[PDB]
Design a protein around this nucleic acid. Structure first.
Lengths: 50, 72, 150, 50
RNA sequence: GAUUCACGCAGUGUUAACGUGCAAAUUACUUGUCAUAUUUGAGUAUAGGGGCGAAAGACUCAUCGAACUAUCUAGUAGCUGG
RNA sequence: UGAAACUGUCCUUAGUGCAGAUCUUGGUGGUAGUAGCAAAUACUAAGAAGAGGAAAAAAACAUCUUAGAACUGAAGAGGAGAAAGGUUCCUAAACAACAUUACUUGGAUUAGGGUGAAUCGAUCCUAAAUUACAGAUGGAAAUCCUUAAGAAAAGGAUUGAAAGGGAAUAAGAUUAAUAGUUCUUAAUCAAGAGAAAUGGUAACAUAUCAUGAACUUUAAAAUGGAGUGUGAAAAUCUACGGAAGAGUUCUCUUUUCUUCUUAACAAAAGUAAAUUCCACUGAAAUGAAUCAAUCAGAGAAGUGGAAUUUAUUGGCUUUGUAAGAAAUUCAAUGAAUUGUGGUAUUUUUGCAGUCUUCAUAAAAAUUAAAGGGAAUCUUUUGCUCGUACUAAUAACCGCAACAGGUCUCCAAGAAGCAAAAUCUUUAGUUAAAUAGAAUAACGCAGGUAAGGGAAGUCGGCAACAUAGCUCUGUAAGUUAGCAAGAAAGAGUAGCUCUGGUGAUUAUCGAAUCAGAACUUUAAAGGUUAGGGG
RNA sequence: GUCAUCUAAUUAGUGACGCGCAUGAAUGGAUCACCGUGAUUCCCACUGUCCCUAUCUGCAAUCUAGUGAAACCACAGUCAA
RNA sequence: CUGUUGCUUAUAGACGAUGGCAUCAGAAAUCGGUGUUGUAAGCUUUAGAGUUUCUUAAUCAAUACUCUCGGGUAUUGAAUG
């Protein structure tokens, strides 16, 4: 609801080129649910897979 | 409550359009017209109402059958 | 494009409210061309306009409370709010009581258990608030019939 | 009201007819000063007293 | 023509809010009342030295110790301003 | 600068000289980019259209769709009417002005479209009341009279109600908007046209039947309120047997949720409740009966009948209507099903008697019957007018999209005595005089507090405090009815059990009361809810 | 007013006395049970009324983007005598 | 040089102002310390009054035992890294 939000939230922000113009960039913040926030640090996610 | 509140119940007409003068002056309960003096045969005119005489009288209308008679 | 006309038209064909109508969020150009009830009817059959189901209202919580209260789980002193006469009307307890007591005296008279003079005397005793329950009256009738043969 | 007399409705209809403006071709006559109809009213702006 | 609660209604108090206001009399809580001397719609009747009033000179279209409107009327002013 | 009239001298004439009159009319400043645009819980994300979210966060972005979160809480911010409004209704284009920002939005601009009746109302009747010819009065305009004055009207003139009376229509579907009005199907009503009957003891009964004039009478239309009991339908709840679809499913859940329907008008398999009459017989040892009553030798109870009412025929189930409709699913227009109950609550609707009045709680149009005895199925038509829309925190009255005012109909779940406060479902809406940042003083609204406890103050003003239910107990005074919920004291939760209150011959069903162990944070108090003497 | 009483303290309240400026009998005299959003006094309980103020929340107020009035105004605006 | 600007900046603050740092800037988690509350969810103690149902296995059962000095929160105006 509007009165309560989670104490901690884990997000995944991904900088991507804009589909219209490739020279422009935009962010896409997504939700990554976790069982607990213990031991979770700032992890940089580079997939780099075929 | 004699001002704004008391105006809410005003939805009952006192005067409606009259048949001889066409004005909304026909009193429904009194069964007479305040302006042209209905069913009374003589038209309602008063000397104190001199402006009321120059608003509806001879010459203020089409004069359909008298314009020819005086021209003739 | 404002789809107000199609939302209102669909709600009348679907015989529901405007809150129960679902228009496809990706096929807006197809829906916006439906400018008549006949056009909406085809869109409904093509599953582009569906009727939302009503929100579920479960009675499981209420059923449990009635089941527990049948065993007298919550009907304590601290959960009673109305007066004694309000919860159980005192007048209707009396209406029921001699609808039961007088039904027994009519059955006994018709079965030959008691005669008219005995039945009449017990009728005024029943009306006089003498027997609290059916068992109390049956005991008196049985007890009084033994003095008949003595 | 929903219920009305026959004469009252015709005088109601004429009030609709007279709530119009000057046609464009009339405004293009030579020496024309009539551009607007100052006998105009709107239902929420002025009651016609009838 | 008992005691109370409710839909409603009123207007006891805060002499609260507002007081170039939501409003030319309203809002919030509190209080009183909430069917027979009750509440209420429409129709109809009563008109200005008149009407109506469980009576406050109260009400009679925001106008009342005598309504509104037009004429007498450019009423009169030993008084005030120019 | 301006682009067609004007000037000097002498006499004559005057609407002849303005800084004021709270002067009149018009225009414009400081105030001032200031006071303000703060009642009605609230919006967020993605996409679409659009010139109209850009950017060194310019922290906010109108409209529409989806998702999340919410509010009105069914005496609604729902669905419909009367008055009032009058085109505000629908669609499309378009946004100069208006809705205290903005607007692609609009109850705003432009242009078209939209209101279908033999059955709904007006039209018809009269109520309070109102108005005519003749007559009476008056100087006068005019007033009186409404059947009394009349050579007027078998009998008394006109108007007066879209809430009083009243011939007759329902279901489904359809429109961008009208629908008891259109389409399909199915009916109904009115005005036409083509010596004169039986049956039952009786109450009374017979697909029109089975003649019935003048005249007269009776009845209906047509009549207060309260409270109690009860029949029936609907809604809600629930038991049983399933069919179809949806939700949950790592922890379980034979689980939770939704649909399983039916009109007007008629028919008569089966079968109810209540009241009033009829035949037999004659009641006392008086009976019969209700929740209460109440009734009987001018005649009870019992048996057997008759009639009326019970939202159309005849009340309920059932039937034609009629499943072909509609609802829920499945498939790519075509297929599946649509039992039976309840000794529960509410609403509606009748019925039965009781109470109450120094109150007794309308009339006519229109219809039927009686007394009387004068006389000898088919088909046609059904005219005039209203019909759109709001009915209100935006269409009505208040100068307005004003927190004011304005008559009604339908009405779910929880909980509780309760149509109370609080939460939710169907329906509606998220906008309703603009937002963002910071979180100073003084404010408006809601609060808390150490020790003391009215010492404040004109004054316990404002706030605090008591508060539901059960048991015990209750003073002086008194018009003997009251005071009285006087005052005062005790109990209340959860879990597991036990017993009482019925119907039919072991099963079936209702919440209500009382009691006992055990446990805990020791229990009316989330909301609602008397301070006392 | 004088006497009791209420309080530590009574121009207040209650109860008495009465040649009462100027009470008094349907201009009604006396008497109150029940009732009263009527006026006055005293007790218990409770509390920010107060000793004596502290602190919390929402809305504004502050600043900003858009929008944007009004009363008032002879001219104006530092003091002492 | 100074000012704007950034750290949604503080020892400051209505707004300005004022104070600090600005590439060895800053911010962020996470980790340890330090605090607040009182023993989380799952399975076990026949904990356990009792009623069911086999028949002397189960089931349901307020509350209570072990795991548990547990779990959750902790700058937001806390303090290391």
């Amino acid at each position: 609801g509007i009165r309560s939000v989670a104490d901690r939230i884990r997000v995944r922000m991904a900088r991507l080129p804009i589909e219209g113009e490739e020279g422009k960039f935009y962010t896409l913040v997504s939700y990554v649910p976790v069982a607990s926030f213990k031991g979770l640090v700032t992890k940089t996610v580079e997939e780099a897979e075929n | 409550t004699k001002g704004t509140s008391c105006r809410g119940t005003r939805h009952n007409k006192t005067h409606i359009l009259c048949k001889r003068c066409g004005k909304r002056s026909w009193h429904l309960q009194k069964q007479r017209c305040a302006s042209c003096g209905y069913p009374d045969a003589k038209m309602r005119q008063y000397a104190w109402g001199y402006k009321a005489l120059r608003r509806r009288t001879q010459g203020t209308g089409r004069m359909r059958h008298l314009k020819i008679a005086l021209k003739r | 494009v404002s789809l107000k006309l199609q939302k209102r038209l669909a709600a009348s064909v679907l015989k529901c409210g405007n809150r129960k109508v679902w228009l496809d969020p990706n096929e807006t150009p197809e829906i916006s061309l439906a400018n008549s009830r006949k056009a909406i009817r085809k869109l409904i059959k093509d599953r582009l306009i569906i009727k939302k189901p009503a929100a579920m209202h479960s009675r499981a919580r209420v059923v449990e409370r009635k089941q527990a209260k049948i065993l007298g789980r919550h009907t304590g002193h601290g959960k009673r709010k109305g007066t004694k006469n309000a919860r159980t009307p005192q007048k209707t307890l009396w209406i029921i009581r001699m609808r039961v007591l007088r039904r027994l005296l009519l059955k006994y008279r018709t079965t030959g258990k008691i005669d008219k003079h005995m039945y009449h005397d017990f009728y005024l005793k029943v009306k006089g608030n003498q027997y609290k329950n059916k068992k109390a009256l049956m005991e008196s009738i049985f007890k009084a019939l033994e003095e008949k043969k003595l | 009201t929903g219920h009305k007399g026959f004469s009252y409705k015709l005088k109601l209809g004429k009030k609709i007819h007279q709530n119009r403006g000057v046609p464009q071709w009339f405004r293009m006559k030579t020496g024309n000063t009539i551009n607007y109809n100052f006998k105009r009213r709107h239902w929420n702006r002025r009651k016609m007293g009838m």
